PDB file of all heavy atoms in Angstrom:
ATOM      1  N   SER A   1     177.353 184.823-132.513  1.00 25.74           N
ATOM      2  CA  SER A   1     177.549 185.744-131.394  1.00 25.74           C
ATOM      3  C   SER A   1     179.043 185.907-131.068  1.00 25.74           C
ATOM      4  O   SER A   1     179.921 185.266-131.655  1.00 25.74           O
ATOM      5  CB  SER A   1     176.779 185.256-130.179  1.00 25.74           C
ATOM      6  OG  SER A   1     176.719 183.843-130.124  1.00 25.74           O
ATOM      7  N   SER A   2     179.314 186.788-130.102  1.00 25.95           N
ATOM      8  CA  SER A   2     180.691 187.090-129.727  1.00 25.95           C
ATOM      9  C   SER A   2     181.362 185.893-129.053  1.00 25.95           C
ATOM     10  O   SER A   2     182.499 185.531-129.397  1.00 25.95           O
ATOM     11  CB  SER A   2     180.734 188.297-128.794  1.00 25.95           C
ATOM     12  OG  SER A   2     180.110 189.415-129.416  1.00 25.95           O
ATOM     13  N   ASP A   3     180.672 185.255-128.105  1.00 26.78           N
ATOM     14  CA  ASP A   3     181.196 184.066-127.458  1.00 26.78           C
ATOM     15  C   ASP A   3     181.276 182.857-128.350  1.00 26.78           C
ATOM     16  O   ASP A   3     181.925 181.864-128.017  1.00 26.78           O
ATOM     17  CB  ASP A   3     180.356 183.737-126.223  1.00 26.78           C
ATOM     18  CG  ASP A   3     178.921 183.450-126.554  1.00 26.78           C
ATOM     19  OD1 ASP A   3     178.450 183.893-127.628  1.00 26.78           O
ATOM     20  OD2 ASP A   3     178.245 182.750-125.762  1.00 26.78           O
ATOM     21  N   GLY A   4     180.616 182.892-129.512  1.00 26.29           N
ATOM     22  CA  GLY A   4     180.646 181.767-130.439  1.00 26.29           C
ATOM     23  C   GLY A   4     179.816 180.580-129.982  1.00 26.29           C
ATOM     24  O   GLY A   4     180.239 179.431-130.164  1.00 26.29           O
ATOM     25  N   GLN A   5     178.660 180.850-129.408  1.00 26.67           N
ATOM     26  CA  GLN A   5     177.834 179.766-128.881  1.00 26.67           C
ATOM     27  C   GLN A   5     176.423 179.810-129.451  1.00 26.67           C
ATOM     28  O   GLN A   5     175.796 178.773-129.643  1.00 26.67           O
ATOM     29  CB  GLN A   5     177.792 179.817-127.362  1.00 26.67           C
ATOM     30  CG  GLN A   5     179.054 179.296-126.712  1.00 26.67           C
ATOM     31  CD  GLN A   5     179.085 177.790-126.619  1.00 26.67           C
ATOM     32  OE1 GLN A   5     178.090 177.134-126.897  1.00 26.67           O
ATOM     33  NE2 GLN A   5     180.245 177.240-126.236  1.00 26.67           N
ATOM     34  N   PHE A   6     175.899 181.012-129.707  1.00 27.08           N
ATOM     35  CA  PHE A   6     174.554 181.174-130.242  1.00 27.08           C
ATOM     36  C   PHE A   6     174.595 181.805-131.637  1.00 27.08           C
ATOM     37  O   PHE A   6     175.180 182.880-131.790  1.00 27.08           O
ATOM     38  CB  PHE A   6     173.672 181.983-129.297  1.00 27.08           C
ATOM     39  CG  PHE A   6     173.676 181.475-127.885  1.00 27.08           C
ATOM     40  CD1 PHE A   6     174.496 182.066-126.940  1.00 27.08           C
ATOM     41  CD2 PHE A   6     172.859 180.419-127.525  1.00 27.08           C
ATOM     42  CE1 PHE A   6     174.487 181.583-125.633  1.00 27.08           C
ATOM     43  CE2 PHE A   6     172.858 179.949-126.243  1.00 27.08           C
ATOM     44  CZ  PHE A   6     173.674 180.521-125.286  1.00 27.08           C
ATOM     45  N   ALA A   7     173.967 181.164-132.599  1.00 29.25           N
ATOM     46  CA  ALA A   7     173.797 181.706-133.913  1.00 29.25           C
ATOM     47  C   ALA A   7     172.447 182.427-134.038  1.00 29.25           C
ATOM     48  O   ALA A   7     171.536 182.188-133.248  1.00 29.25           O
ATOM     49  CB  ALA A   7     173.898 180.628-134.981  1.00 29.25           C
ATOM     50  N   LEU A   8     172.357 183.279-135.045  1.00 24.06           N
ATOM     51  CA  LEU A   8     171.131 184.027-135.309  1.00 24.06           C
ATOM     52  C   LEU A   8     170.884 184.031-136.798  1.00 24.06           C
ATOM     53  O   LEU A   8     171.726 184.514-137.554  1.00 24.06           O
ATOM     54  CB  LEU A   8     171.230 185.472-134.804  1.00 24.06           C
ATOM     55  CG  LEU A   8     170.041 186.348-135.151  1.00 24.06           C
ATOM     56  CD1 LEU A   8     168.801 185.857-134.452  1.00 24.06           C
ATOM     57  CD2 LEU A   8     170.355 187.772-134.774  1.00 24.06           C
ATOM     58  N   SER A   9     169.730 183.519-137.216  1.00 22.49           N
ATOM     59  CA  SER A   9     169.452 183.359-138.627  1.00 22.49           C
ATOM     60  C   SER A   9     168.154 184.050-138.998  1.00 22.49           C
ATOM     61  O   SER A   9     167.221 184.136-138.187  1.00 22.49           O
ATOM     62  CB  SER A   9     169.368 181.899-139.017  1.00 22.49           C
ATOM     63  OG  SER A   9     168.120 181.357-138.626  1.00 22.49           O
ATOM     64  N   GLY A  10     168.098 184.544-140.226  1.00 25.77           N
ATOM     65  CA  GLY A  10     166.884 185.098-140.765  1.00 25.77           C
ATOM     66  C   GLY A  10     166.563 184.427-142.082  1.00 25.77           C
ATOM     67  O   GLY A  10     167.440 183.928-142.772  1.00 25.77           O
ATOM     68  N   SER A  11     165.280 184.380-142.426  1.00 27.93           N
ATOM     69  CA  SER A  11     164.834 183.578-143.538  1.00 27.93           C
ATOM     70  C   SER A  11     163.779 184.298-144.356  1.00 27.93           C
ATOM     71  O   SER A  11     163.287 185.370-143.959  1.00 27.93           O
ATOM     72  CB  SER A  11     164.284 182.229-143.104  1.00 27.93           C
ATOM     73  OG  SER A  11     163.716 181.540-144.181  1.00 27.93           O
ATOM     74  N   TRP A  12     163.422 183.699-145.490  1.00 31.55           N
ATOM     75  CA  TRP A  12     162.384 184.240-146.335  1.00 31.55           C
ATOM     76  C   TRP A  12     160.982 183.850-145.864  1.00 31.55           C
ATOM     77  O   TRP A  12     160.009 184.306-146.475  1.00 31.55           O
ATOM     78  CB  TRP A  12     162.548 183.745-147.778  1.00 31.55           C
ATOM     79  CG  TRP A  12     163.651 184.438-148.535  1.00 31.55           C
ATOM     80  CD1 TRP A  12     164.696 185.103-148.029  1.00 31.55           C
ATOM     81  CD2 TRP A  12     163.769 184.483-149.954  1.00 31.55           C
ATOM     82  NE1 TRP A  12     165.495 185.580-149.033  1.00 31.55           N
ATOM     83  CE2 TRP A  12     164.946 185.217-150.234  1.00 31.55           C
ATOM     84  CE3 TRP A  12     163.020 184.010-151.015  1.00 31.55           C
ATOM     85  CZ2 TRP A  12     165.363 185.488-151.526  1.00 31.55           C
ATOM     86  CZ3 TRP A  12     163.430 184.264-152.301  1.00 31.55           C
ATOM     87  CH2 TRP A  12     164.594 184.991-152.553  1.00 31.55           C
ATOM     88  N   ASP A  13     160.865 183.046-144.810  1.00 35.07           N
ATOM     89  CA  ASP A  13     159.527 182.807-144.259  1.00 35.07           C
ATOM     90  C   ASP A  13     159.066 183.867-143.292  1.00 35.07           C
ATOM     91  O   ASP A  13     157.935 183.837-142.846  1.00 35.07           O
ATOM     92  CB  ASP A  13     159.489 181.409-143.591  1.00 35.07           C
ATOM     93  CG  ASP A  13     160.553 181.206-142.496  1.00 35.07           C
ATOM     94  OD1 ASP A  13     161.177 182.187-142.036  1.00 35.07           O
ATOM     95  OD2 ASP A  13     160.750 180.048-142.102  1.00 35.07           O
ATOM     96  N   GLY A  14     159.945 184.817-142.963  1.00 33.96           N
ATOM     97  CA  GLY A  14     159.573 185.949-142.153  1.00 33.96           C
ATOM     98  C   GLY A  14     159.883 185.826-140.690  1.00 33.96           C
ATOM     99  O   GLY A  14     159.279 186.551-139.896  1.00 33.96           O
ATOM    100  N   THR A  15     160.783 184.930-140.299  1.00 33.87           N
ATOM    101  CA  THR A  15     161.063 184.693-138.908  1.00 33.87           C
ATOM    102  C   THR A  15     162.564 184.807-138.657  1.00 33.87           C
ATOM    103  O   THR A  15     163.378 184.850-139.605  1.00 33.87           O
ATOM    104  CB  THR A  15     160.606 183.301-138.441  1.00 33.87           C
ATOM    105  OG1 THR A  15     161.209 182.292-139.242  1.00 33.87           O
ATOM    106  CG2 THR A  15     159.094 183.196-138.511  1.00 33.87           C
ATOM    107  N   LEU A  16     162.941 184.882-137.392  1.00 31.81           N
ATOM    108  CA  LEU A  16     164.311 184.818-136.945  1.00 31.81           C
ATOM    109  C   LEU A  16     164.432 183.694-135.936  1.00 31.81           C
ATOM    110  O   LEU A  16     163.498 183.442-135.153  1.00 31.81           O
ATOM    111  CB  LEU A  16     164.779 186.133-136.327  1.00 31.81           C
ATOM    112  CG  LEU A  16     165.247 187.293-137.214  1.00 31.81           C
ATOM    113  CD1 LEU A  16     164.118 187.983-137.893  1.00 31.81           C
ATOM    114  CD2 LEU A  16     165.988 188.273-136.332  1.00 31.81           C
ATOM    115  N   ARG A  17     165.566 182.997-135.953  1.00 29.56           N
ATOM    116  CA  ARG A  17     165.797 181.919-135.006  1.00 29.56           C
ATOM    117  C   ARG A  17     167.149 182.094-134.332  1.00 29.56           C
ATOM    118  O   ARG A  17     168.148 182.415-135.003  1.00 29.56           O
ATOM    119  CB  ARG A  17     165.731 180.566-135.709  1.00 29.56           C
ATOM    120  CG  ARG A  17     164.344 180.185-136.159  1.00 29.56           C
ATOM    121  CD  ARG A  17     164.278 178.772-136.689  1.00 29.56           C
ATOM    122  NE  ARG A  17     162.922 178.403-137.045  1.00 29.56           N
ATOM    123  CZ  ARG A  17     162.203 177.472-136.426  1.00 29.56           C
ATOM    124  NH1 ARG A  17     162.723 176.827-135.401  1.00 29.56           N
ATOM    125  NH2 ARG A  17     160.978 177.205-136.821  1.00 29.56           N
ATOM    126  N   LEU A  18     167.187 181.850-133.034  1.00 30.15           N
ATOM    127  CA  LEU A  18     168.399 181.996-132.231  1.00 30.15           C
ATOM    128  C   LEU A  18     168.839 180.585-131.861  1.00 30.15           C
ATOM    129  O   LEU A  18     168.394 180.003-130.863  1.00 30.15           O
ATOM    130  CB  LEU A  18     168.164 182.872-131.005  1.00 30.15           C
ATOM    131  CG  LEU A  18     169.389 183.526-130.400  1.00 30.15           C
ATOM    132  CD1 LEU A  18     169.051 184.900-129.899  1.00 30.15           C
ATOM    133  CD2 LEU A  18     169.925 182.693-129.251  1.00 30.15           C
ATOM    134  N   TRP A  19     169.735 180.032-132.662  1.00 27.76           N
ATOM    135  CA  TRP A  19     170.180 178.648-132.488  1.00 27.76           C
ATOM    136  C   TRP A  19     171.192 178.518-131.378  1.00 27.76           C
ATOM    137  O   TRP A  19     172.019 179.404-131.153  1.00 27.76           O
ATOM    138  CB  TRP A  19     170.807 178.126-133.763  1.00 27.76           C
ATOM    139  CG  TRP A  19     169.942 178.269-134.957  1.00 27.76           C
ATOM    140  CD1 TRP A  19     169.817 179.348-135.750  1.00 27.76           C
ATOM    141  CD2 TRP A  19     169.087 177.273-135.488  1.00 27.76           C
ATOM    142  NE1 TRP A  19     168.926 179.091-136.746  1.00 27.76           N
ATOM    143  CE2 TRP A  19     168.465 177.818-136.606  1.00 27.76           C
ATOM    144  CE3 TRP A  19     168.795 175.948-135.111  1.00 27.76           C
ATOM    145  CZ2 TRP A  19     167.548 177.098-137.350  1.00 27.76           C
ATOM    146  CZ3 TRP A  19     167.892 175.259-135.859  1.00 27.76           C
ATOM    147  CH2 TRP A  19     167.269 175.815-136.953  1.00 27.76           C
ATOM    148  N   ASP A  20     171.113 177.413-130.652  1.00 27.03           N
ATOM    149  CA  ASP A  20     172.158 177.003-129.741  1.00 27.03           C
ATOM    150  C   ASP A  20     173.020 175.970-130.444  1.00 27.03           C
ATOM    151  O   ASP A  20     172.540 174.899-130.821  1.00 27.03           O
ATOM    152  CB  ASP A  20     171.561 176.421-128.435  1.00 27.03           C
ATOM    153  CG  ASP A  20     172.622 175.960-127.474  1.00 27.03           C
ATOM    154  OD1 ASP A  20     173.079 176.774-126.658  1.00 27.03           O
ATOM    155  OD2 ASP A  20     173.013 174.768-127.536  1.00 27.03           O
ATOM    156  N   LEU A  21     174.294 176.320-130.650  1.00 28.27           N
ATOM    157  CA  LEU A  21     175.168 175.538-131.509  1.00 28.27           C
ATOM    158  C   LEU A  21     175.468 174.135-130.962  1.00 28.27           C
ATOM    159  O   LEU A  21     175.616 173.193-131.717  1.00 28.27           O
ATOM    160  CB  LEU A  21     176.478 176.299-131.773  1.00 28.27           C
ATOM    161  CG  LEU A  21     176.322 177.482-132.727  1.00 28.27           C
ATOM    162  CD1 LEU A  21     177.662 178.121-133.007  1.00 28.27           C
ATOM    163  CD2 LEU A  21     175.636 177.044-134.004  1.00 28.27           C
ATOM    164  N   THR A  22     175.621 174.018-129.631  1.00 24.90           N
ATOM    165  CA  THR A  22     175.996 172.754-129.005  1.00 24.90           C
ATOM    166  C   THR A  22     174.938 171.687-129.231  1.00 24.90           C
ATOM    167  O   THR A  22     175.255 170.567-129.671  1.00 24.90           O
ATOM    168  CB  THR A  22     176.248 172.952-127.506  1.00 24.90           C
ATOM    169  OG1 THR A  22     175.056 173.425-126.887  1.00 24.90           O
ATOM    170  CG2 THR A  22     177.366 173.929-127.284  1.00 24.90           C
ATOM    171  N   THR A  23     173.693 171.993-128.917  1.00 27.72           N
ATOM    172  CA  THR A  23     172.617 171.037-129.185  1.00 27.72           C
ATOM    173  C   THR A  23     172.308 170.939-130.674  1.00 27.72           C
ATOM    174  O   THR A  23     172.024 169.855-131.178  1.00 27.72           O
ATOM    175  CB  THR A  23     171.360 171.421-128.424  1.00 27.72           C
ATOM    176  OG1 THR A  23     170.725 172.545-129.042  1.00 27.72           O
ATOM    177  CG2 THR A  23     171.707 171.772-126.978  1.00 27.72           C
ATOM    178  N   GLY A  24     172.378 172.063-131.385  1.00 30.55           N
ATOM    179  CA  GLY A  24     171.938 172.120-132.754  1.00 30.55           C
ATOM    180  C   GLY A  24     170.483 172.468-132.923  1.00 30.55           C
ATOM    181  O   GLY A  24     169.979 172.407-134.049  1.00 30.55           O
ATOM    182  N   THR A  25     169.807 172.876-131.874  1.00 33.11           N
ATOM    183  CA  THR A  25     168.390 173.220-131.911  1.00 33.11           C
ATOM    184  C   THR A  25     168.210 174.674-131.528  1.00 33.11           C
ATOM    185  O   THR A  25     169.108 175.310-130.983  1.00 33.11           O
ATOM    186  CB  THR A  25     167.578 172.336-130.925  1.00 33.11           C
ATOM    187  OG1 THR A  25     167.852 172.723-129.579  1.00 33.11           O
ATOM    188  CG2 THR A  25     167.915 170.872-131.119  1.00 33.11           C
ATOM    189  N   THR A  26     167.028 175.194-131.847  1.00 32.26           N
ATOM    190  CA  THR A  26     166.735 176.591-131.612  1.00 32.26           C
ATOM    191  C   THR A  26     166.231 176.830-130.211  1.00 32.26           C
ATOM    192  O   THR A  26     165.686 175.942-129.558  1.00 32.26           O
ATOM    193  CB  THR A  26     165.704 177.089-132.618  1.00 32.26           C
ATOM    194  OG1 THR A  26     165.247 178.386-132.218  1.00 32.26           O
ATOM    195  CG2 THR A  26     164.544 176.137-132.657  1.00 32.26           C
ATOM    196  N   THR A  27     166.442 178.050-129.709  1.00 35.21           N
ATOM    197  CA  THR A  27     165.940 178.470-128.408  1.00 35.21           C
ATOM    198  C   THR A  27     164.803 179.466-128.528  1.00 35.21           C
ATOM    199  O   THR A  27     163.709 179.225-128.022  1.00 35.21           O
ATOM    200  CB  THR A  27     167.083 179.047-127.564  1.00 35.21           C
ATOM    201  OG1 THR A  27     167.366 180.381-128.003  1.00 35.21           O
ATOM    202  CG2 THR A  27     168.325 178.192-127.673  1.00 35.21           C
TER     203      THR A  27
END
């Protein structure tokens, strides 16, 4: 993201995940 805090990933399993970088876990 712009603020550099949340990542966004897409995969071959057909889902998207919005990661929180500080914890390392998804939201």
Side-chain angles (χ1 to χ4, degrees):
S1 33
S2 303
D3 61 337
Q5 284 279 351
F6 308 98
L8 175 65
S9 77
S11 172
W12 284 21
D13 56 13
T15 58
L16 277 74
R17 289 188 177 247
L18 202 143
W19 306 84
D20 179 88
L21 288 184
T22 60
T23 75
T25 72
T26 169
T27 76

